[PDB]
Design a protein around this ligand. Structure first.
Ligand SMILES: CO[C@H]1/C=C/O[C@@]2(C)Oc3c(C)c(O)c4c(O)c(c(/C=N/N5CCN(C)CC5)c(O)c4c3C2=O)NC(=O)/C(C)=C\C=C\[C@H](C)[C@H](O)[C@@H](C)[C@@H](O)[C@@H](C)[C@H](OC(C)=O)[C@@H]1C
Ligand SMILES: N[C@@H](CCC(=O)O)C(=O)O
Ligand SMILES: [Zn+2]
Ligand SMILES: [Zn+2]
Lengths: 95, 130, 152, 116, 50, 293, 1099
DNA sequence: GCTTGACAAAAGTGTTAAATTGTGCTATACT
């Protein structure tokens, strides 16, 4: 677009933070020490943030651009460009 | 602080201004610095000689010749347009600001005089004994 | 300021600033110094209220609202740093200085930035509202004269 | 085991206290789009469209479905034989002939510079 | 003299066994050679000492 | 003073509850990347260890709550969870900062925006750009005021995409792939092509520090032998350029509007008088003075 | 002089150096020899000094000995450290990327008081890095230098600061120890609100003693009457809660609090420096505390002498933190010692705790001891420490100044940004100790300096300077090294003063220096010490500037800093007009080959030089040949002796990089013309004769090192091979079987050096890519191409190759199978844009290089080589460059003073045997004793062959040059001569960058700067200001959107240029999109709103 | 031009064994 009118700030409520979130990161795990792949439910979890490779799910049962915007029933990752890995946010539910 | 200051219109039409000295008492003697105070300005009101002789009309560029002509008539002050008295709603007006030092002519309407002022003031700062 | 009035302070500040630069042999036209001074006296203090006492509000923004067809203030002299922080643009004040301070107050006041200043447009990649970016210039329409198209 | 024990380093670390250069900003983006390649690839995509124009409607049709040029999804010999109504072997035959036709220097000479 | 070829050395930045001058400092000396060739068409000279 | 804050929450629809967090947002992973360098060893952003402390303590808190645990223990966790989130947002703002190996403080979310190295000054108000270069400058006494000497090697790379098209328009190269390699290896045919693309195509010449706008000026490029840049001797005053080893940056205006601005607004010969005092700047100096005197 | 093979360089000095320049490398060696305390250092202290010399290692080992826990039931004693022979040679270490070190062993005693047993076990501490002959270290293969640090010596220092509130005088005191909390007058450990009297009650002294000891102090009595603290135990409580807030005290903790903080030796360390400073000025005990208060009281009262019970009288005066008497130097040995102590204190913790949980009597020195923190201290110091520096070796001089460099930065000293300007200023006590002229120009001015020539470091860390004491107007031969403190005590006569035949003050009055310092006179009766010689204050680099006295300190400072930046040439000609330091500095640098035994040469080859000493023994020296220096310069060596030559101990056998016949040769001598020339040499620019290219006079060699490894990948193993996935057989034309460039080949930007391939995963080729694979039948390979190529804008010849394989036994880190290093070298002709300079701070780039045909040439037809502009000379205050331009011509053509009837009047003042000199004879003018103006003129008119008997230069140093273009003489006489100009390490080939498109940063999509990453320039804030002032919106938007950050726009613009279409409209800068994300991560809801279509999403 | 049957390589599936991973536990007394 490149033409917006106003840019506004405001206190983010816990609901706003939850609506931004694509899922709750529950583990303090970055990546597996052997396979070097993102650990599920942790930071970098492909199920929450997004795929590592374009149109490829974690397990790979859906690897083609033929079906975009579908979630793999096994790994739970969405099939789309890995650019979303840079656009999506998680959240943490504090006890 | 001045980056948002830009010429927005030709003339705000206000009659307000500031009084430049431009000479004093001589001979019984141009002011030390009329080049940075009087020159490049624009007259806010007519410069009237010691009668109704008016020698320079309001809205004159006030170049080098006009100062000599003015001095002949013996005018020891002049009221001039300034951005301090400009009444423009947004930014300033060309007439109030005056001539553009780079072009030598009336400032264009797009000019961003705010930044040009900050840079004209700061650049010599390296030459100031601090 | 309080003694001789706003229009006299500016004459003083310009003389003082122009004296230092004259001591080192520097030639700066007063108008440049005037552009900067003009920005220190753009606001006034609100002694009584829509407005709160002790706040620094823009002069023009204070006249139209104060009328309210059917709240007094005094001219305020303030430094460039303090003045520029009071700018209406919140992301402009953020990039300038005291980012955390600016962001916390902007989020509480729920500020909205119109993106009019030229620094705001630089950040988001818009055309600055100056020079060739002004509306009259960028909206210029060009076509060859019918007499010229004939000559081909 | 000695590779497992290695611990990562900080991208926010300053490499060299001399030059306040943060390691993080020295890291390339290997997956970034390269302009010259994507443009040449676009040009390559056009040159293939033309070369296939020389082939027959079914010759090119089988080549496109075999490699999935249109859909991006390759197809098996039997599946292509199911659209044109033939056996997979017949498609295997039509494949070999159109490939030797593509190997004909007239059509291949233009695509040579796209090796990589 | 345009080029030169020495058996043991493959480039200019090495030394030769027994020689007091490195190859780069020998070429510096050889630049002072004043030669006159009465024929066109590059001609190779030869030098061998033991 | 206290009324200023209390009043701010009234007019705005913000509920003051926002100042206490029930949930904490997690930044996208590519903004806190973890990647392996050349050789295999890994590097990652500090935010992950910061997020790791928060997640650890929050999860440990759930554990103590369920078992049932003396307040001394539970309260200790909440105090720890509070500090962890504080360091995540603004590390060091309260107490000693969270440090890593070598006792160097970790980089909080606030540390991304603030300072000369933050997003605003580093990546927003300035940035590194394509189609640019630099080199040491040498005098150009034979140049016209509107011209500058440009190293042929430097010019070739700057205009690479342009010459590639020109030598493909001409039969020099058959496809863009051949054009690219023909420039990389510098086959002698390109030079005659480079002069054409460079013709009447302006470039911007800047020397830091840029004090006034005259610190950037457009010139007409001229292919020059050597790797140095030839600068007109009359523009030294504006650039404050000494030939004691100074360097200058070159930028290539691309769009029609950008080239128009270069030729019209920033052209060398159109800017002569300083825009502060009106005095002339390109005025002769130092040699031309004694030469004419 | 006094060096056997020293070349004959005539000097103009009117004095005689009474003391040779000491070994300029001693400062680095003596420090290390103290640490290791070898026999060479043992004999030093034994001959004259203490009778119990203690090596730095032993000294720190005494502190630990013995170890004991709270029970004191078991004790572990340390003693007798030992070193084995060095593991590998320095040359082998730099080759194998290891660190030159010698293993260290110690004696570990473990005594159980209950069982009364002894378990003596030899312990291995670790490989201890050793210092080379050149005072350097080899840390992981690279040669490094440990610079000495400047710090405030621990002690009691007072200062008087006036308070504007009362407009009256105030006095504050500070006591800075070796370690522990610091106190200030009470102000203790950043805890204010303390009455100095309350602590005197904390010790338990009664108020009566306060009135007894305070005495004449008025505020001393008035403060105790004001303090409301009653009792010695109650004051300890008022001191307790403020020092340990939040902790309820106890009578056991309140009393040991004070003693443990300072009196206890553990937490408050008595410093040998601090213990010595105050012990004379007045470990911790009350005696030192009360003495400070009594000292402070007298200072505020105004008395200059203070005495107390059982104390020696001393003056009560304020101290100067910048006086070198209170500011010391932490040499390398001490910087190492401190890092060892940190390792032992960390091991002591594990030694003590290990005893508790370990089975008693089943523990041994090996079990209790763990050296992980000890070796980690050493390893973590030589690497990553600010004082352990990558050695600066462009030339022998640059390296010789790196060592001898003194720094105020680093841990334990003021940091760079915080320090005030008061320290940076020169101080009177810097004379002869720290050169005031050599220092950085940038933000580090005054904080970094080089040790003076004759300076010497004290075992306590204070710099000493050599002096010759005078008694009754007679200067003896007694030379006494004095510290700054004892220097002010005496009066220092000036180095040059008229000498009387056998020794006596001839002048009626003598120049003197006071403790002010002040300059005054006496009749030579009250002088005590005199200067050893001029240039005591000067450093090595500074002392190499001919006519130093004539150039202003500004341009001189530039002149010194630029000598280090020179680069070794191929020919390496020595300076025609030099100073005394040339030959002395080259040998002491270490880049020259010196013979250590008198003898005769057996062989001489480019490879090595052997000498047959008279002793019958045989020494040999392998010559460094084209060795890549740390910074890329060429470290080649060449022999200067023949076969049958005789030699003497300490002579020069071969020349180093920048040396000729034993003396430093940082540049060439060139024929100079000081006329302005057709606006080509203008504004410091320079023009050269093309001769300087054809004859390789300014040519120099540079060498690069490229490296690539083959490691184990999770998907396979990297393999170095000649097979590349997609390449022409021509690109591999210069590769051998293994896939590494063949020695002696030429390499061009982008060429292949080492072929490497790495496994690939799940290719999934594009359909357009698979169709071509079937057509042309090139099977898609299973591995990606990650190969080593030559960097952009870099070329040369392949000198040598170094291959480390895993198959071959060699050592590699886990995962690395094969590592190959390729060395490329190139001859760099002097090019326009390269930076040249003289020793006087005059610098400038090469503006143009004219054919030797058309150039100002003398009547001889001899073209001048350089043409320097006339205008930059007068205003800069560096006129020495003109002097050496005149003398340079004198030494080139020779001269003969008129023997007619006697010696002219100008040569009357002690020029001896300098009356005649042949053509090309070299000259030496020591800085402050060099030639004088009168003597120059007399020499300007002198011997006159070119070949014919015609003069080419008059007595004014001018000549009539002929323009090489028009062929007509220049109207006026122009100054010609020979000047010594250096080639500086700022080269155009390395500084010219250009970029159209390239790599982009990962998080931010901006191009990454630096030539290494092929990056683009930075268009910064100030530049955007200038762009805004012009009013060019589209230019500004372009630079910030489609040229850096627009991920989709930058690929479109490229597509548009290639197709000749119009450049599209810009998009949203990726950086801004990241900003909104980073603001959202702070719980800031940032919404981008439309005019009326409220919310927008960035996707 | 196209189809049929024999056939082997390649690709999936299900079934198992080996391995990898998570968790519980250790009782002189030690605060
Ligand atoms: C761990 O070592 C580092 C610690 C920095 O931390 C920091 C904050 O604490 C420092 C200490 C304690 C110093 O004593 C010091 C110094 O004496 C010095 C420079 C100046 N350096 N520059 C020279 C000029 N050039 C325009 C820029 C760089 C420094 O910056 C520092 C310095 C720092 O900056 N010396 C000069 O200025 C002079 C008179 C000559 C320079 C010769 C060469 C150039 C250098 O010696 C090269 C060979 C390296 O040795 C250094 C660069 C080290 O870098 C490395 C990788 O080795 C650096 C000491
Ligand atoms: N474009 C300017 C106004 C243009 C004008 O001056 O007409 C804003 O926005
Ligand atoms: Zn899946
Ligand atoms: Zn106006």
């Amino acid at each position: 677009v490149n033409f917006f009118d106003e840019l506004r700030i405001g206190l983010a409520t816990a609901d706003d933070i939850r609506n931004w979130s694509y899922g709750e990161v529950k583990k303090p795990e970055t990546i597996n020490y052997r396979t070097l792949k993102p650990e599920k439910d942790g930071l970098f979890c492909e199920k929450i943030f997004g795929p590592t490779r374009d149109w490829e799910c974690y397990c790979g049962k859906y690897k083609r651009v033929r079906f975009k915007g579908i979630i793999c029933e096994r790994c739970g990752v969405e099939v789309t460009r890995a650019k979303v890995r840079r656009e999506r946010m998680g959240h943490i539910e504090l006890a | 602080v001045s980056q948002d200051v830009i010429v927005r219109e030709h003339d705000c039409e206000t009659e307000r201004g500031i009084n430049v000295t431009l000479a004093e008492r001589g001979p019984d003697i141009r002011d030390a610095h009329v080049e940075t105070s009087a020159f490049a300005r624009t007259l806010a009101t007519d410069a009237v000689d010691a009668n109704g002789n008016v020698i320079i009309e309001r809205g004159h560029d006030l170049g080098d010749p006009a100062i000599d002509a003015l001095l002949a008539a013996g005018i020891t002050t002049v009221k001039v347009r300034s951005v301090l008295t400009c009444t423009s709603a947004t930014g300033v007006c060309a007439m109030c600001y005056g001539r553009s030092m780079a072009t030598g002519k009336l400032v264009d309407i797009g000019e961003a005089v705010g930044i040009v002022a900050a840079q004209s003031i700061g650049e010599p700062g390296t030459q100031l004994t601090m | 300021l309080r003694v001789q009035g706003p229009r006299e302070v500016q004459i003083h500040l310009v003389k003082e600033v122009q004296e230092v630069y004259r001591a080192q042999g520097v030639s700066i036209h007063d108008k440049h110094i005037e552009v900067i001074v003009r920005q220190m006296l753009r606001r006034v203090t609100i002694i009584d209220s829509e407005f709160l006492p002790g706040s620094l509000t823009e002069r023009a923004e204070f006249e139209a609202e104060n009328r309210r067809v059917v709240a007094a203030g005094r001219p305020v002299l303030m430094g460039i740093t303090k003045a520029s922080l009071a700018t209406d643009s919140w992301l402009s004040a953020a990039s300038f200085q005291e980012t955390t301070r600016v962001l916390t107050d902007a989020a509480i006041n729920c500020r909205s930035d119109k993106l009019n200043g030229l620094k705001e447009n630089v950040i988001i990649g818009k055309l600055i509202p100056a020079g060739t970016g002004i509306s009259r210039y960028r909206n210029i329409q060009v076509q060859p004269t019918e007499e010229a198209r004939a000559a081909a | 085991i000695q590779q497992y024990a290695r611990e990562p380093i900080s991208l926010d670390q300053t490499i060299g206290d001399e030059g306040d250069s943060q390691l993080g900003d020295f890291i390339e983006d290997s997956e970034a789009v390269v302009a010259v390649d994507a443009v040449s690839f676009t040009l390559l995509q056009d040159q293939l469209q033309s070369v296939l124009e020389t082939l027959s409607e079914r010759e090119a049709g089988v080549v496109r479905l075999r490699f999935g040029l249109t859909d991006g999804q390759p197809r098996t010999l039997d599946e292509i034989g199911q659209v044109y109504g033939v056996t997979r072997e017949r498609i295997r035959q039509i494949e070999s002939k159109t490939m030797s036709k593509l190997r004909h220097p007239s059509r291949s000479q233009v695509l040579r510079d796209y090796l990589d | 003299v345009t080029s030169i070829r020495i058996d043991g050395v493959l480039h200019e930045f090495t030394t030769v066994p027994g020689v007091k001058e490195d190859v780069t400092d020998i070429i510096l000396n050889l630049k002072g050679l004043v030669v006159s060739s009465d024929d066109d068409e590059p001609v190779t000279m030869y030098l061998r000492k033991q | 003073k206290r009324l200023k804050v209390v009043a701010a929450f009234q007019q705005s629809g913000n509920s003051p509850m926002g100042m206490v967090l029930d949930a904490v947002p997690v930044i996208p992973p590519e903004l806190r990347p973890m990647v392996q360098l050349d050789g295999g060893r890994f590097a990652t952003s500090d935010l992950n260890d910061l997020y790791r402390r928060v997640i650890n303590r929050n999860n440990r808190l759930k554990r103590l709550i369920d078992l049932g645990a003396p307040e001394i223990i539970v309260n200790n966790e909440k105090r720890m969870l509070q500090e962890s989130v504080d360091a995540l947002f603004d590390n060091g703002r309260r107490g000693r900062p969270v440090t890593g190996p070598g006792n160097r403080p970790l980089k909080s979310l606030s540390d991304l925006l603030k300072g000369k190295q933050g997003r605003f000054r580093q990546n927003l108000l300035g940035k590194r750009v394509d189609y640019s270069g630099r080199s040491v400058i040498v005098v150009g006494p034979q140049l016209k005021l509107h011209q500058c000497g440009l190293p042929k090697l430097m010019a070739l790379e700057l205009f690479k995409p342009f010459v590639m098209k020109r030598l493909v328009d001409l039969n020099h190269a058959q496809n863009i792939k051949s054009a690219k390699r023909m420039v990389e290896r510098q086959r002698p045919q390109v030079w005659d092509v480079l002069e054409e693309v460079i013709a009447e195509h302006p470039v911007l010449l800047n020397r830091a520090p840029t004090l006034h706008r005259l610190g950037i000026q457009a010139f007409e490029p001229q292919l020059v032998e050597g790797k140095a840049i030839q600068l007109h001797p009359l523009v030294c005053e504006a650039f404050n350029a000494d030939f004691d080893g100074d360097q200058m940056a070159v930028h290539l205006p691309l769009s029609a509007e950008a080239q128009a601005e270069a030729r019209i607004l920033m052209l060398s010969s159109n800017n002569i008088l300083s825009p502060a005092s009106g005095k002339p700047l390109a005025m002769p100096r130092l040699d031309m003075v004694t030469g004419l005197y | 002089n006094s060096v056997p093979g020293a070349p004959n360089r005539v000097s103009f000095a009117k004095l005689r150096e009474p003391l040779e320049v000491p070994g300029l490398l001693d400062v680095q060696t003596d420090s290390f020899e103290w640490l290791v305390g070898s026999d060479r250092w043992r004999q030093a202290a034994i001959d004259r000094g203490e009778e119990n010399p203690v090596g730095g290692l032993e000294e720190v080992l005494a502190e630990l000995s013995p170890i004991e826990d709270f029970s004191g039931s078991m004790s572990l004693s340390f003693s007798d450290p030992r070193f084995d022979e060095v593991k590998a040679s320095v040359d082998e270490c730099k080759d194998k990327d290891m660190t030159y070190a010698a293993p260290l062993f110690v004696t570990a005693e473990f005594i159980n008081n209950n069982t009364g047993e002894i378990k003596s076990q030899t312990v291995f501490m670790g490989d201890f890095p050793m210092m080379t002959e050149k005072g350097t270290f080899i840390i992981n293969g690279t040669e490094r230098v440990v610079v000495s640090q400047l710090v405030r010596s621990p002690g009691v220092y007072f200062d008087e600061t006036i308070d504007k509130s009362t407009e009256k005088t105030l006095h504050s005191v500070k006591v800075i120890p070796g370690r522990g909390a610091w106190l200030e007058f009470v102000r203790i450990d950043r805890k204010r609100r303390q009455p100095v009297t309350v602590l005197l009650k904390a010790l338990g002294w009664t108020n009566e003693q306060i009135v007894e000891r305070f005495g004449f102090s008025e505020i001393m009595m008035g403060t105790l009457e004001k303090d409301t603290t009653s009792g010695t135990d109650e004051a300890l409580l008022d001191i307790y809660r403020k020092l340990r807030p939040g902790e309820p005290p106890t009578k056991e903790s309140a009393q040991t609090l004070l003693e443990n903080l300072f009196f206890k030796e553990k937490r408050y360390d008595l410093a040998r420096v601090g213990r010595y400073k105050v012990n004379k000025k007045l470990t911790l005990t009350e005696e030192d505390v009360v003495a400070t208060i009594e000292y402070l009281v007298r200072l505020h009262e105004g008395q200059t002498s203070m005495t107390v019970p059982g104390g020696v009288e001393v003056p009560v005066e304020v101290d100067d933190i910048d006086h070198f008497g209170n500011r010391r130097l932490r040499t390398v040995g001490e910087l190492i010692q401190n890092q060892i102590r940190v390792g032992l204190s960390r091991m002591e913790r594990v030694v003590r705790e290990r005893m508790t949980t370990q089975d008693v009597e089943a523990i041994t020195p090996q079990t209790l001891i763990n050296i992980r923190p000890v070796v980690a201290a050493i390893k973590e110091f030589f690497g990553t420490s600010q004082l352990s520096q990558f050695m600066d070796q462009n030339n022998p001089l640059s390296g010789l100044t790196h060592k001898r460099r003194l720094s105020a930065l680093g841990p334990g000293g003021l940091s760079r940004e915080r320090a005030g300007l008061e320290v940076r200023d020169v101080h009177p006590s810097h004379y002869g100790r720290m050169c005031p002229i050599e220092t950085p120009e940038g933000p580090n001015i005054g904080l970094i300096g080089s040790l003076s020539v004759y300076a010497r470091v004290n075992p306590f860390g204070f710099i000493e300077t050599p002096y010759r004491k005078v008694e009754n107007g007679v200067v003896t031969d007694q030379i006494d090294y004095l510290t700054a403190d004892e220097e002010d005590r005496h009066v220092v006569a000036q180095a040059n003063s008229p000498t009387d035949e056998n020794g006596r003050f001839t002048e009626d009055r003598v120049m003197v220096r006071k403790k002010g310092g002040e300059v005054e006179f006496v009749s030579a009766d009250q002088v005590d010490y005199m200067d050893v010689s001029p240039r005591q204050m000067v450093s090595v680099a500074t002392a190499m500037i001919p006519f130093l006295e004539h150039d202003d300190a500004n341009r001189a400072l530039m002149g010194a800093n630029m000598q280090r930046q020179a680069v070794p040439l191929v020919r390496s000609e020595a300076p025609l007009v030099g100073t005394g330091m040339e030959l002395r500095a080259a040998i002491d640098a270490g880049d020259v080959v010196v013979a250590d035994k008198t003898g005769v040469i057996e062989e001489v080859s480019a490879d090595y030089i052997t000498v047959m000493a008279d002793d019958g023994t045989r020494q040999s020296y392998r010559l460094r040949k084209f060795a890549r220096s740390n910074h890329g310069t060429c470290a080649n060596q060449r022999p200067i002796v023949d076969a049958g030559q005789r030699v003497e101990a300490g002579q020069v056998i071969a020349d180093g990089p920048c040396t000729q016949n034993g003396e430093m040769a940082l540049g060439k001598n060139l024929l100079v013309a000081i006329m302005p020339w057709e606006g080509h040499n203008y504004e410091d620019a320079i023009i050269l004769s093309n001769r300087l290219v054809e004859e390789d006079v300014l040519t120099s060699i540079h060498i690069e090192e490229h490296e690539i490894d083959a490691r184990d990948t999770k998907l396979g193993a990297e393999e170095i091979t000649r097979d590349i996935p997609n390449v022409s057989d021509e690109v591999l034309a210069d590769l051998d079987e293994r896939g590494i460039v063949r020695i002696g080949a030429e390499v061009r930007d982008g060429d292949i050096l080492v072929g490497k391939v790495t496994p690939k995963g799940e290719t999934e080729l594009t359909p357009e890519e698979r169709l071509l694979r079937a057509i042309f039948g090139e099977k898609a390979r299973e591995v990606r191409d990650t190969s080593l190529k030559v960097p952009h804008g870099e070329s040369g010849k392949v000198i040598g190759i170094r291959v480390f394989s895993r198959e071959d036994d060699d050592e590699l880190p886990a995962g690395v199978n094969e590592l190959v290093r390729v060395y490329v070298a190139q001859k760099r002709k002097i090019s326009d844009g390269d930076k040249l300079a003289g020793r006087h701070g005059n610098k400038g780039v090469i503006g143009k290089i004219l054919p030797v045909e058309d150039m100002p040439f003398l009547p001889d037809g001899t073209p001048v080589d350089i043409i320097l502009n006339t205008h930059g000379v007068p205003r800069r205050m560096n006129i020495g460059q003109i002097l050496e331009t005149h003398l340079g011509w004198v030494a080139k053509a020779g001269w003969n003073i008129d023997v007619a009837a006697g010696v002219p009047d100008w040569a009357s003042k002690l020029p001896e045997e300098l009356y005649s000199a042949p053509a090309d004879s070299t000259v030496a003018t020591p800085v402050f004793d060099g030639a004088q103006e009168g003597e120059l003129a007399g020499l300007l008119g002198s011997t006159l062959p070119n070949r014919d008997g015609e003069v080419m230069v008059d007595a004014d140093g001018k000549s009539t040059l002929f323009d090489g273009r028009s062929g007509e003489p220049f109207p006026y006489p122009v100054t010609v001569g020979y000047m010594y100009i250096l080639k500086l390490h700022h080269l155009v080939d390395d500084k010219i960058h250009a970029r159209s498109t390239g790599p982009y940063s990962m998080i931010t999509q901006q191009p990454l700067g630096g030539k290494a990453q092929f990056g683009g320039q930075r268009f910064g804030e100030m530049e955007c200001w200038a762009m805004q002032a012009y009013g060019a919106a589209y230019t500004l938007q372009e630079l910030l959107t489609i040229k850096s950050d627009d991920t989709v726009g930058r690929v479109k613009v490229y597509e548009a240029i290639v197709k000749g279409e119009n450049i599209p409209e810009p998009g949203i800068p990726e950086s801004f999109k990241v900003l909104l994300k980073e603001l959202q991560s702070l719980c800031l809801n940032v919404e981008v709103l439309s005019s009326d279509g409220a919310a927008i999403e960035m996707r």
